[PDB]
Amino acid sequence: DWRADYHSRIGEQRRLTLADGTQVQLNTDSALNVAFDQQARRLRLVRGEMLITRPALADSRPLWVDTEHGRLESTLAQFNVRLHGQHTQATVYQGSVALQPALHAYPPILLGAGEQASFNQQGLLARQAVAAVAPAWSQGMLVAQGQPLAAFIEDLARYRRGHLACDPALAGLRVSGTFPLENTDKIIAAVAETLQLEVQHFTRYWVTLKPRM
Amino acid sequence: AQADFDIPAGPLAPALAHFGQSAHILLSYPTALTEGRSTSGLAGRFDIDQGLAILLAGTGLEASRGANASYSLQASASTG
Description:
The complex is a heterodimer of chains A (213) and B (80). Chain A has helices at 149-157, 184-194, and strands at 2-7, 14-17, 23-26, 31-36, 41-47, 49-53, 63-67, 70-83, 88-101, 109-112, 115-119, 124-129, 141-148, 163-166, 174-180, 197-203, 206-211. Chain A is mostly beta strands. Chain A folds into two domains: 1-136, no CATH class; 137-213, no CATH class. In chain A, the strands form three sheets. In chain A, strands 1, 2, 3, 4, 5, 6, 7, 8, 9, 10, 11 and 12 form a twelve-stranded mixed beta sheet that branches. A three-stranded mixed beta sheet of chain A has the order 14-17-16. By secondary structure, chain B is of the alpha+beta class. Chain B has helices at residues 12-23, 31-34, 48-55, and strands at 2-7, 10-11, 27-30, 38-39, 42-47, 61-65, 71-75. The longest helix of chain B has 12 residues, at 12-23. The termini of chain B are far apart. The A-B interface holds A 131, 136, 139-141, 143, 145-146, 174-180, 186-187, 189-191, 193-195 and B 13-14, 16-17, 19-21, 24-32, 34-35, 68-70, 72.
């Protein structure tokens, strides 16, 4: 068999090549355990976010990505998996994935390319189309398309040690743009300037976006 | 600075998401400014500034930059 554990630090992206030649990228603050056995190529995403690319074309074993919420079974697919606090989100870019929520595994939910879905242990929570052909983070970017500010900063904070927040009056302000992850201070400064906000930064690890006046 | 672009015609907002990723730039602008607009797209190798201007043809918008490396957008400047 073959059996490895991986983690990435806050702000770190890592490239792995598994024994079968399947490529995995880990995003910021993530943890992956891999266990290939006779039945299956098992990946367990314990924390964070990963992208599977270049799946092995002719391994007889299925590829399974499990989280606490269920299983994603891959058929030749390239796909992103992110673990949130109360659900898992899968995004498929190539091929197809079968989603099997832990407490309702059959019938599987089939996700094709250009589809994104969130699920918990009991089942589907949301699903929609996406036009991305790879996750932005895997190319070193954040991409926002009218994303509410509170959600944008929740995502950005994953890449940073400190706390990032906005005043509740600002929570639904829409963020649009593309943001290199190489300098997250520049991201904050640019978004604050575009949205005409003040950046309160009185202690190193606590930043709050506020109305200007 | 140049990049290879292959951005089809379509709504402007997703085209700009595509553009900023292809150019690997910090591009930040108000969501309302680009909502419900269209582009003829951008296909070829271009200087990033020239490419952005081409993408924005017909939209009523132009590229903007300042002292830091970042890009923004604004309504086309008056000429008189």
